[model samples]
Target chain A: ATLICGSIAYDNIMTFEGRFREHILPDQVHLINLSFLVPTMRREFGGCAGNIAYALNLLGGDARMMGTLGAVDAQPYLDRMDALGLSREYVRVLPDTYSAQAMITTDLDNNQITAFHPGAMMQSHVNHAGEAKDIKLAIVGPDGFQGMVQHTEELAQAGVPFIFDPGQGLPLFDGATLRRSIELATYIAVNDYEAKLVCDKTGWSEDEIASRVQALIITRGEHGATIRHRDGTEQIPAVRAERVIDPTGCGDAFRGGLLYGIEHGFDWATAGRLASLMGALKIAHQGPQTYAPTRAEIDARFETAFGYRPKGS
Target chain B: ATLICGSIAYDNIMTFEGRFREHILPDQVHLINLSFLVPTMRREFGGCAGNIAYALNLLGGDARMMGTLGAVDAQPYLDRMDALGLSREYVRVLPDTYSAQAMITTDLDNNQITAFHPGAMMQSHVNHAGEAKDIKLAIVGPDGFQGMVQHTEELAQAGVPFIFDPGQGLPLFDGATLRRSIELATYIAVNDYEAKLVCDKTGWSEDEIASRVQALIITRGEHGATIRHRDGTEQIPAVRAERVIDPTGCGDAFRGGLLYGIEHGFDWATAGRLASLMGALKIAHQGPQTYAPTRAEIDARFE
Candidate 1:
């Protein structure tokens, strides 16, 4: 893909209310039975490649996706990506393994109970890094953690400044490996929990996270994104979504917009706003990468999330 | 089975943290990896019969438990109850269906996520109202809702004063069945949530709950039991236990004690205290019916 390389898979999501405080003893079962319904229902295309590529596509970038496909499971994701106008040059039809499938049961509080199987995505490997293909940036997304590690090493040797978006596989990296990846990263983006984990493993405080990397971006969901540069720290408010349906691809959208801005020579503030807009737009739609925002819709969200959309090319 | 005429099952428990507050957009690729640990796990005796009879046994009562059980699943509950000196005379063995099982996955915020299978419990019909030997009081504890409904009818005909303790199966009852159950129950013991469900379905106020039944007993886990009588409502303080290993049988224990006290003609306050004490004692140990508190243990707890 132009901006990112990773496996694309299906994600099933569900939701609940309050904590599970009922079955717990007061000293033991702190919380228990209280049921709530999740109104949003969807079964859509999502894999690392599709997830990231869709975001780049939204930003008017021609991004490609790479994945392994088999019979039934791979067809939906591939068809959806094609329909969405993203290139799928590297997706291979392997003999074994269905595509990566994630069964996510989310509650009203957004607490997800999930089970995943790395079907075709497990056997899937990137043939080559796109560093020589005039690609300015790439993200090593999930379902190919081992492959990403190997690719990152190759990209580093090739002198490519790639963003290591180790989304879910962030926990798989040992402290040493994590530290090495951070050192190799031109940019490192992490969610709140993963950021905390990095902090714990690296023995770095929040301030250290700011100083350690070239660009450290942490998405705080409703709180928006926080960026740390050589200059200083800046908090980018998340775009306010008019209506929220599904929140599956906000992260990829953020990364896509951020990288798009970076490639197009946008300033940090402008890039962050763009990324924030992607997150806001994704929140108002169902399915990851399925939200096809018009330029006007994007600008409206940009205006809502930030005071004004910055003037640029 | 004397007191419990239903399933004996095992509960597989798991936990999580924080409320799920975020919407999972279809457009976003979402993945949630929940890592947790179960410290020193063991398979113990559990079943509706084992649960209720064991609690009654803890309160110095010998109640029979009759229910279909798989040979493998029935052994633990049987051995544990035998050790506790509780009788399981009427428990029938069923070869086909597996025993009832509950898989509970809880979160860090004391959230319990559980899935229950009505395995062996659903096979046999425990309609023992007409044929059973002399019975003082019957407790329709956690079992098949249909069976409980049938048994309720028989019990009413037999002139038996029974406490309807539909622990987890509150939702199965239709509005009319639930209303009838409440109206027919000499004593109604339910948890806070179940009570709310009862009230919601019956369209009854708190005063109606007290008035509709002979006595209404509600257990609020650690807070203790609330006994609403004609005179007034009394909040009996729970007996605080030192070791709270697993809370599987705590509620059944309370019901056992309450039934015993009621049979002995004790006042509602004393009965509520006994219920509280039973609950406290059961939390001190694991398994459903294994925690048979000695007279001394009971005295010390009360003291």
Candidate 2:
């Protein structure tokens, strides 16, 4: 089973029919009192680990989520995991917590006011990645600074090669920590800007960062990824999406595909192509975990994009 | 059967562990950007009609509620009405709408910030009280301004003596509307402040307003009520409550007791006393619909 470490949160999405500009005045910035009557709300189970686990499960991988949840709102997410066929063994529910929540209110004009409550996710350090046995591979995501560092150290200590993905938590690390992660991890995954930020933080060139690890995959939005590995740089073009409904969790989709590809032992170019295609696939769906494509459907799409069916090691 | 015309809403109560004063800057009120991680939330079935119906039902009165609910989240409230043994014949569920909700956030310091989404409650006018038959009495509460005015007009036309209760909707009426409601109703109920505001609005003394209706009950909270009627005025004393847990829905409890007393053929003095006692009974409870005392329990306490 794949060990994916990150935060699991409920996305409380609310839609306000009116524009924010009408209610909140420009001059009354210092003494503002206001509330929007959001008539519609939909609660979705999401977050880094949950989203990646969803995408990986869609690819027919045994995705076991390793993260923390709040005791108050634990059942809904756990029930969702059961429905989705994802394991809950490594998921820790912190007591006296209400789980992580991202309360996003979007007005009719599409401007959003977001408030993130990092409840149990902040205390994810209580869960240890080293404790889990028989974990073939894993991906370390940005949960919290402590959890991220501790998980990486434990995963490396157990000789379980992992993908060090410092997503939004990339800034939490210094040059020394970044370098140490690069030394320990078999692969490092970063988005377009995260690639630059990682290099800037670690004072390493693209080739040097690539040589330091087995591979370094830099995801560029539409253009695709430039995966520099020991073999060579595989420039995988992004598959043109069916529709661009939402790109909110597209990065996680790619990461899930990467894990799925490596676990199935697909070649670097084929894996990168499949990963790029999954990103395109996820962008068409509104919510992160909304889409569900069959494994056969994924294979057929993979063949259509890369002119061959994927073969396992 | 007592027909209650009002809004039925879900009260989404949240408790924030910290104080609001710490997060919100007094100097920079304009650019207030903050969010509290409320660890607890309890959803209770509330709103004027629902609360009144609950209290009235506790006293063995047939409390038929006339309200509107949104189709989206209508099941839970309807299910609650079922378990509570209240009739849904007069209640209407509107399509393409959400049920009314009061999102109340209270901080550790007991300071509250509330936002009310009218939702289907705004369309409460769609459900009419005039269609209901054999309604001995009714109480019209603040649902939406339109429904409040319309229900009063219809209830009076049907010769069903109803209590014209403004509650939070006091500000919606002009002098003419207030006087018109006073002229049509059998009884008018107002709190100490609402009583003053109604007098100020209509330019009428306490005697004049009391004479227009069968009875005028002005609740003075801890000082009980002043029930003015054709016979005379009876100043009822407030009951010595066991404890004051919450006073949020004390007025509605009093109104519910008044309805039950009238239905049970009690005298004005007894009715006013019972109403005053119910207000005391409610203050010891946390939520509006949280307390459920048996009819015997109520009678024993009443004796």
Candidate 3:
């Protein structure tokens, strides 16, 4: 079983009436303060850990989410978990605050400007990670600043190999703190822009970062990913998405595939391909957790894309 | 007790990133196909009956909602009614279809484009209106086309003096159908634009329309409202909103205040002023039913 520690909250999704590029002047980006009159909106279930565990469970992985929810909001989340037969034992509830909320506005070109309110997610305690039994692998995904730091320390101390994914939380750390995180982590995963930030903060090249951990994975949306191990680097091609309806949870979906591949002992080549395919499928769905492709469907797509079905599938 | 017969559903609210006038070219009026990329969105509890009943209940009035809900969506509405101590005996649930949904987008200027899916609301039965006991007054608000027509006939047959509020449903009727609705209704309530449409379709002037009913009420947003009876037209002053956060359910809130005034036997001037105050309070909140001003607050605000 793998423990995923991160945010759990509602996403208030909005759509911009026009293209962002047309309205946003590139010359005056620093003084950016503008509002969009979104004529269409809806609330969808979201949060980093909620998104990651959803995809992980859909892929038939034993993934448990550790997070906090508001007292009133916990019931709906609990009901969702019970309906999906996913675990909810690790979840905690805070009475005073609402669940974390992300106000996401998507422009015509699918560009997003998100404002997040931590709410109950800020109350996430690291003790839950230490208390969780039989966690073979773990991930400290983007979450509260203290929760991420404390959980990373606890997981490392418990001798559990973990994937350190700073995600949107990368800005919260400075050079020294981030470098220490790199030392503690067994593996690191990030997107290309995030990879650049990591390298720039620590003053390390891609090769230097790879030497510090078992592997370093950098994802490039649509272009696929790059996996660097101690021996060498391998480029993974992005799977062609049938259609890109919404790109909200694609990265978290990719992480689920990565966790699945590592836990099932798939080769790095197979693992990266799996992650790419998961992202491709997720992009076609409107809501993050609404997509459910059967195991057979996953294997069929895998075989069609990479010339063979993944071992466990 | 007032029975509010209309749609009850979830509203998918969205915000546009920029001004709409810039994107919508005036010359390209015939080919009006456009899509908005909304970056922020939320689901709020809304619908004509939902908004009306909420404001009515908040004013300590016995306003019963007669509507349909999808099986899954019924629980939240039920919970809201229970928490507010509102009656839900007339509410029906359909096991198959989802609740009706309104996809509403508001621009920077508070202009809106709303697309509605009837869903379970299309299944609202006229028999429920007849089944309602001891209803002194009621409003045939917007609903499924057939439900509006059928319930208007039923309410008239049951000897309940009702207000004909065509709302967005006005366009669905022909001139003859609207004229007949006017004949059956004791009063007619509509927005300014809707009043013009009503007059245009029925081939009647404002004076001619007022002659057919006990009163004719027309609401003009921000400019106040007008009520025409046998005496003359009463110009009701609009209450100033402290800040306009949203304008989604202000009309329904106005209707709620109207129903409250009528129930308390207030004169037309007082009723219209009360309605205007409700509209002002509604504009100060983001969601239609989210605003809650207590009876004491309402009186204090009134004073």
Candidate 4:
């Protein structure tokens, strides 16, 4: 079972009819404050952990979600999870405050300005790694600053090798703290920009960081990703997406596929390809958790992308 | 008890950064299509019935809300009403469709464009006027097209004197249908624009409409309202609003106050003043039902 720790929140998604680049003046960026009137809007269930867990479940993996929600606002999320058959044993609920919320507006160019409110998500206190049971893998995704630090410590103490995925929460940690986290982690996963930030803060070269972990994975949006194992590095090519609808949860979906591939004992090259295919599929849909693909469909995608069926398939 | 009939919906309110007039070219309006990137947004509980009922209850009136909602999405709304001690006896829940929703975008100039989806709100079937219960006053506010017409007929059949509040639902009726609705109602409430449309469609002048009902009310946004009673016309002054944060539910709030004043046996002038006060209080707040003013506060405002 995969233990995913992250935030669970409501996302208010809005669409801008005009291009953002045209409106934003480069010289006036220092004091930039602009608003747009979006005629279309939707409220969808979202959060890093929720998106990852949903993707994992779609890929036929047992993903246990651990997140926090407000007392009154948890019912709808719980009902959705129940319907999806994802376990919420490690979920926490706090009174008085609402669940975390992300107010995101996407321009015509798909540039997003997200205002996040970390309400009850700041109070997540559970660590499933502390339980006296064998765990296959764990991922500490984005969450409250303290929750991420606490979960990292608990997972290390339980002798569990976890993938350190700081994501948007990376800025909360300094060079020393980030170095310490990387030293304690078995695998490190990040996007291209995050990788640069990690390198800059820790004063380490890409090679130096890869030498510390079993593998270092860096995702490059639509350009595919690179995986650095101890022996060598491999470039994972980007798979063709049927259509690009929304790019909100593609990264999380990629991580879900990577986790599934690792558990199923696929090689690093094959696992990276699988992750790329997952991202491709996610981009073809609107919401994070709205896509449902059969196992055969995934196998077919894998065969077409890599010229071979997956090891488990 | 006041019977408030209308849609119960979630409103996705968005704020536009720039003025709408800058982007909208008048000459190209026929083929105009534009998109805006709104930086700020909120999801608030709204709908005409919900807004009116909340205001009525705030003014110490017993309001029973009648609407339909989705089975799952109704919990939050139900919880809110429960905390407010409002009756939900007439509220119905459907399994498949979600609750009604309104996507409203307001520009820097406070001009708004709204896209409303009547989801389960289209299935609102409970007509409290059909039952043998004693209903003092009722307003058949905007709902499904047929639901509005059907409820108006039901209230007329039961010998219930109700205000014909067509609101945004006014456009659904033709000349004959609108004339029939006016003939059946004891009072007709509409904005200045809607009042003209009613007149043009029904071929009834302001005096002609006043002759048909006990009173013909026309609301002018900031200019106040004109109540045409058979005795003489009374121009109710517009109450000064503290701030105009939002204008989404000001009309509904006014209707609530009107209902309260009519029920408590206040004269038309006093009732119109009370309604104006409600609109003022509503404008000072952001969301429709977020403001909860005390009865003493309202009475003080009235005095």
Best by DockQ: 2
> Residue-wise lDDT of candidate 1 within A1-313, one digit each (tens)?
3546676777644444433322222343235554443333245577667777888887788786655665545666667767877666667766645566654544444444544455666665544664336565667676555676776776677776777777776656788887787777778888777788888987778677666667888888877888887887778887667787767778888888887877777777778888878887787877776677887777776776677765566
What does DockQ come to for candidate 1? 0.09
| Model 2 docking tier (incorrect/acceptable/medium/high) | incorrect
List of chain B TM-scores, one per candidate: 0.80, 0.91, 0.86, 0.86
Interface RMSD of 4: 11.2
Instruction: Tell me the tens digit of each residue's lDDT in model 3 across B247-289.
Output: 9899999999999988888999999999899999999999899
Task: In model 3, state the lDDT of residue A313.
Answer: 38
Q: Name the best candidate (by TM-score).
A: 4
> Per-prediction DockQ scores?
0.09, 0.12, 0.06, 0.07
Candidate 1 or 3, higher TM-score?
Answer: 3
lDDT tens digits, residues B1-303, model 1? 245554577764433333422212222334343422223223556766677676766656767776667653465666665776665666766653446765455444545455445666765465466467777778777676667777667777777788887777777887788888777777788988888988898888867877877888888889877988878888898787878898877887787778778778788888889888888888878676567667677857776
Best-to-worst order by TM-score is 4, 3, 2, 1
lDDT of 2 at B191: 87
Which stretches of candidate 1 lie above 4 Å from their native place?
A17-41, A130-132, A205-212, A311-313, B1-112, B115-303
Q: Lowest summed-lDDT stretch of 10 residues in model 3 chain A?
A: A24-33
- State the weakest 10-residue window (summed lDDT) of model 4 chain B: B24-33
- The root-mean-square deviation over C-alpha atoms between each candidate and the true structure, in angstroms, is 12.5, 8.3, 7.0, 6.5
Ranking by lDDT: 2, 3, 4, 1
Q: How would you order the candidates by DockQ, starting with the best?
A: 2, 1, 4, 3
